[PDB]
Ligand binder design. Structure first.
Ligand SMILES: CCCCCCC(C)(C)c1ccc([C@@H]2C[C@H](O)CC[C@H]2CCCO)c(O)c1
Lengths: 227, 233, 339, 282, 58
């Protein structure tokens, strides 16, 4: 077939390489890729410690219910975000962690802007980014107990002057959640899954599994022409 | 280092069946296509069989087709050659040959150590010079001819030059001509014109003596010309 | 007391440089090349498509033989294609799946890659053992490596997101000559044909020319209004072309220390990701992110042709050393050879 | 066979214009959606959309062949040769069965979209999409082209509603398609149940997915069982008795419910898809 | 103290960039114009190569 013996063997080697590439692609396509984009140190390590494990970028591997996950703690980049944020386009979901204890604290570097306001700004920047239009966001509101004791002892009006609810924890948490969710300008092609976690919480992995299955089911239904 | 230890030969009565095992270590056996090359006690080299990576393509010589079978076990890093109904023409030294095939590769770069076995339409490659006397420091020119042009339409001419020192396995000197093997000195050089081919050594040393074999890889079966023996004065 | 004086001195020097550059602009490149026959329509067809990747392709580099090219993709694979036969010579698994650069050594013995891992990994192609091994993991950068280039088998220049370029000794595995002076992230660097000077285009809308043995910035080039993403010397070595996010390619000449001409079109409003020159230097192939690559005449602002056929953003393209082909790698997992 | 063409009268013009109008516009819709799927160059890589294209092609073929054969055989009263009338019946039946099989293939795809969410991309790839599609087409071909091969109504009297086909084979194919409707009515049961299980599980921490799936799948199933139940019921009932009343004329009228299902297939299936809408707009 | 040293480095760099010798654009543009004219024959992209000598025939 107008080919030498070495050319035929090279074609065979290329076919074997392609087969290995297809196997690797099938293996990777069954893995869930999540991007961790917590603001500063707003409980970004307690969640990964809760999830266990089963330099600029950090990859965390954990399996739950025979499903492989891929977390990418890319916060240690210290560079311009938009020059590398398109590498993560196509991840199943973005795990955004926000510490509710930041409603009283003020950023040390600026000493003017509230830390939770900085988290809200980061959430607005990342939720409306062009690369992440169809990528759902899993919102984590950590520091539940510390926020409980603060809201019992201190008011929330420092961070949100336009607040009408009481000082009870439930109303304050609901207000923070709705303020964070209101930043989503893509109400149609995106969903925000919100969960309140503490240090001793153990259902965070189950919540993430439920959220990722929801995202994958919606993506499959959109792909199969049913939506 | 890289080595190929092969064993499984010995006294076999005619009509018997004995298999040869070639243990591969120090290199990725899975990605390499492996050959079996014969050598009669006083004659030249003869190709026997070849199994590719993944056993996709398996080829045999006309004298062993349907009679021998060759297989490999990648997890165990071993090569097998089950021979059935051995005759008096199979008494020879069997060599385990390592080969890879990509652009710029060096097939037949490494050879085994031999397995002593004794039994109680193809391109013709010719080397007229049976014996050549020479003194160290001189220049030689070993000539090899082909019955069919080995210059393919892709520009690659498929001829390989091997050196067999006395008591040692063949060592690759020059793959597809004007290409120098990884390890051999710059004294060796090869050139040809499609049918007539030559190997030139600039200066000779005591370690360059032996028998030189020219081989064709254009199409199976691979044919070895009768070697040119170089002897000191 | 002194900081204001230093700022005023720097401003006065900047005005003096600006005044010096203007005095050398007796004419313009467009005016001189007015009486030159245009190159006309350049109909380049996708000769051979290179398929097998499974993710976004972020970088590629040709070899010296103009037959073998490497490709880096987000799937963690580094395939060395045989463009003449569309064959995968090698498939290199990568510890980090995030890659933004890949370079082919002139000798062909080594290949490099890098990305968000902040490490330049040098892979040895031809060895014993029949495998590709990690020859050296060059660490020390505090940001993502945007581009890496081989000077020789032992020296490699790397640009990263720490506003710094580095020169490495692969055998020693130690950074040799740090290149500081940029303000934003360095996104691409090109090596001169003589392998003596290199220009790095950073996110500060400026390209800086460096000297290898000295580590000093000989001269800095400005004029862009956005982040520079691509850079490439002229084949002569006395000029280079930059690609930015403002839909603009600028040809800067080293000897006049200014900009020669601008390759901009009102129809194009996207950015520019990859820029390369032809062998003769007459055509400037720029890889835009609007699914297309534009063939720009280097001496006249007219656009010769458009390279269409990519279903996503074109991220990398380079011309072979013999100028016989152009290989464009886009975000869709395909490489296309053009002639 | 003149007794089979018992439908006549002033309603001949009405039935003829109805047949030709529905056939023309249904063929137009099916060819339009086929071209929209093929020319997109992105829907080809998606295994579900090639199943939708198979539905579109089977629907186009069914509409064209059924309309042409019906206008040539009933309103024009053009009797066909005994060798080729059976072939035409086999062709219309093959296209109808292939359309139902493509519906079942889309149904099992939508099931796999929920049973194996993470592995759905790998479980049904582009290569595996055609092999299950090709086997369905030939299997639907052989069950319908069996009379073409060696069956000429030799055993048992031929069915009254369908000329030149036995009552024995009528139950045989109806059983085949009853099981084929059994699959499409069962897998959608698992899609709605697994959606119900998943929706409740996520809501425990804190119904729209269930509502959307229920609406879409209920519309699909209601259209299928309102455009196919009358004809299958009449066919099953015709086996017991001679059935030589005006019921044959009523069957002739309601056979256009098949063309109605053909018309509504694009709007329900592809025009509901967002990607089809976007590609049509662009 | 923290930034008074950084400004001096910038001033020195600007001084080094200022003292370089510069040629007119007319001389610089001609050299690029002359380089393209001399190497135009050996540019497969600019001048299409016959299919016999084109490695990417198909
Ligand atoms: C006989 C195998 C199954 C046929 C399924 C299609 C369908 C039930 C819709 C059907 C088939 C045939 C007819 C007509 C019956 C008349 O007695 C003679 C002319 C037939 C149509 C010929 C063109 O298809 C029908 O009305 C419905």
């Amino acid at each position: 077939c107008t080919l030498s013996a070495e050319d035929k063997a090279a074609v065979e080697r290329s076919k074997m390489i392609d087969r290995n590439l297809r196997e690797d692609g099938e293996k990777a396509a069954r893995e869930v890729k999540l991007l961790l984009l917590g603001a500063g140190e707003s409980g970004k390590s307690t969640i990964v410690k809760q999830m266990k494990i089963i330099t600029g970028i950090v990859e965390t591997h954990f399996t739950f219910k025979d499903l492989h996950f891929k977390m990418f703690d890319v916060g240690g980049q210290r560079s311009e975000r938009k020059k590398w944020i398109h590498c993560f386009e196509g991840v199943t979901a973005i795990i955004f962690c926000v510490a509710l204890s930041d409603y009283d604290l003020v950023l040390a570097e600026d000493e003017e802007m509230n830390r939770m306001h900085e988290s809200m700004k980061l959430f607005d920047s990342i939720c409306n980014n062009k690369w992440f239009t169809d990528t759902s966001i899993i919102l984590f509101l950590n520091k539940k107990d510390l926020f409980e004791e603060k809201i019992k002892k201190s008011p929330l009006t420092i961070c949100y002057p336009e607040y009408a609810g009481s000082n009870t924890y439930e109303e304050a948490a609901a207000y923070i959640q709705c303020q964070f969710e209101d930043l989503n300008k893509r109400k149609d092609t995106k969903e925000i899954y919100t969960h309140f976690t503490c240090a001793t919480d153990t259902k965070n992995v189950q919540f993430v599994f439920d959220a990722v299955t929801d995202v994958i089911i919606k993506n499959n239904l959109k792909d199969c022409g049913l939506f | 280092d890289v080595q190929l230890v092969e064993s499984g030969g010995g006294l076999v009565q005619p009509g018997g069946s004995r298999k040869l095992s070639c243990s591969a270590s120090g290199f990725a056996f899975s990605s390499f296509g492996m050959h079996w090359v014969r050598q009669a006690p006083e004659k030249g080299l003869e190709w026997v069989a070849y199994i590719s990576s993944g056993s996709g393509t398996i080829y045999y010589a006309d004298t062993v087709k349907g009679r021998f079978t060759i297989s490999r076990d990648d997890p165990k890093n071993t090569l097998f050659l089950q021979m059935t109904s051995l005759r008096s023409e199979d008494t020879a030294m069997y060599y385990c040959v390592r080969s890879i095939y990509y652009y710029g590769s060096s097939p037949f770069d490494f050879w085994g150590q031999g397995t002593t076995l004794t039994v109680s339409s193809d391109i013709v490659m010719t080397q007229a010079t049976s014996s050549v006397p020479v003194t160290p420091g001189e220049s030689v020119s070993i000539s090899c001819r082909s019955s069919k042009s080995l210059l393919h339409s892709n520009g690659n001419t498929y001829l390989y030059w091997f050196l067999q020192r006395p008591g040692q396995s063949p060592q690759l000197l020059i793959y597809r001509m004007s290409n120098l093997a990884s390890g051999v000195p710059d004294r060796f050089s090869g050139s040809g014109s499609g049918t007539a081919f030559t190997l030139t050594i600039s200066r000779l040393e005591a370690e360059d003596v032996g028998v030189y074999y020219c081989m064709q890889h254009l199409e199976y079966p691979l044919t070895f010309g009768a070697g040119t023996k170089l002897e000191l004065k | 007391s002194e900081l204001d004086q230093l700022r005023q001195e720097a401003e006065q020097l900047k005005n003096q440089i600006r005044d010096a550059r203007k005095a050398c602009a007796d004419a313009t490149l467009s005016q001189i090349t007015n009486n030159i026959d245009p190159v006309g329509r350049i109909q380049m067809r996708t000769r051979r498509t290179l398929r097998g990747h499974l993710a976004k392709i972020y970088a590629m580099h040709w070899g010296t033989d103009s037959r073998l090219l490497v490709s880096a993709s987000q799937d963690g694979k580094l395939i060395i294609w045989d463009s003449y036969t569309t064959n995968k010579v090698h498939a290199i698994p990568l510890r980090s799946s995030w890659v933004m650069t890949c370079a082919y050594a002139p000798s062909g013995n080594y290949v490099a890659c890098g990305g968000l891992d902040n490490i330049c990994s040098i892979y040895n192609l031809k060895t014993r053992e029949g495998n590709v091994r990690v020859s050296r993991e060059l660490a020390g950068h505090t940001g993502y490596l945007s581009c890496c280039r081989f000077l020789d088998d032992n020296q490699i220049v790397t640009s990263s997101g720490d506003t710094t370029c580095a020169l490495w000794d692969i055998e020693t595995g130690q950074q040799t000559t740090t290149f500081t002076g940029h303000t934003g992230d360095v996104m691409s660097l090109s090596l001169a044909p003589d392998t003596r000077l290199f220009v790095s285009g950073a996110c500060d809308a400026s390209a800086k020319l460096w000297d290898v043995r000295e580590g000093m910035c000989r001269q800095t080039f400005t004029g862009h209004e956005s982040d520079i993403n691509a850079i490439c010397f002229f084949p002569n070595g006395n000029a280079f072309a930059t690609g930015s996010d403002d839909a603009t390619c600028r040809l800067f000449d080293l000897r006049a220390d200014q900009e020669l001409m601008t390759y901009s079109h009102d129809n194009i409003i996207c950015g520019i990701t990859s820029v390369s020159f032809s062998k003769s230097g007459r055509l400037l192939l720029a890889g835009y992110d609007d699914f297309n690559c534009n063939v720009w005449d280097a001496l006249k602002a007219d656009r010769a042709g458009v390279l269409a056929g990519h279903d996503n953003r074109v991220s990398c393209l380079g011309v072979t050393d013999d100028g016989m082909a152009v290989a464009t790698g886009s975000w869709d997992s395909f490489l296309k050879i053009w002639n | 066979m003149k007794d089979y063409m018992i439908l006549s009268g002033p309603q001949k013009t009405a039935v003829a214009v109805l047949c030709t109008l529905l056939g023309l516009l249904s063929a137009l819709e099916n060819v339009a959606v086929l071209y929209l799927i093929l020319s997109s160059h992105q829907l080809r890589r998606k295994p579900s959309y090639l199943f939708i294209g198979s539905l579109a092609g089977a629907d186009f073929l069914a509409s064209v062949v059924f309309a042409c054969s019906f206008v040539n055989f009933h309103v024009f009263h053009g009797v066909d040769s005994k060798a080729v009338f059976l072939l035409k019946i086999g062709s219309v039946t093959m296209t109808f069965t292939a359309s139902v099989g493509s519906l079942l293939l889309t149904a099992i795809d939508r099931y796999l979209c929920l049973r194996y969410p993470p592995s759905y991309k790998a479980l049904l790839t582009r290569g595996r999409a055609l092999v299950t599609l090709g086997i369905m087409w030939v299997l639907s071909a052989l069950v319908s082209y069996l009379p073409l091969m060696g069956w000429t109504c030799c055993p048992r009297p031929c069915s009254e509603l369908f000329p030149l086909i036995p009552n024995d084979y009528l139950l045989s194919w109806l059983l085949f398609i009853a099981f084929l409707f059994s699959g499409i009515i069962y897998t959608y049961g698992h899609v709605l149940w697994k959606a119900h299980q998943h929706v409740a599980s996520l809501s425990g921490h804190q119904m729209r997915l269930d509502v959307r799936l229920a609406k879409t799948l209920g519309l699909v199933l209601a259209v299928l069982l309102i455009c196919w139940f009358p004809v299958l019921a009449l066919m099953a009932h015709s086996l017991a008795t001679t059935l030589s009343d005006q019921v044959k004329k009523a069957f002739a009228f309601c056979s256009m419910l098949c063309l109605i299902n053909s018309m509504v297939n694009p709007v329900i299936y592809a025009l509901r898809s967002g990607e089809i809408r976007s590609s049509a707009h662009h | 103290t923290a930034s008074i040293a950084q400004a001096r480095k910038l001033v020195e760099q600007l001084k080094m960039e200022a003292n370089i010798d510069r040629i007119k654009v007319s001389k610089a543009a001609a050299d690029l114009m002359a380089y393209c004219e001399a190497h135009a024959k050996e540019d497969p992209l600019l001048t299409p190569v016959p299919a016999s000598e084109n490695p990417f025939r198909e």
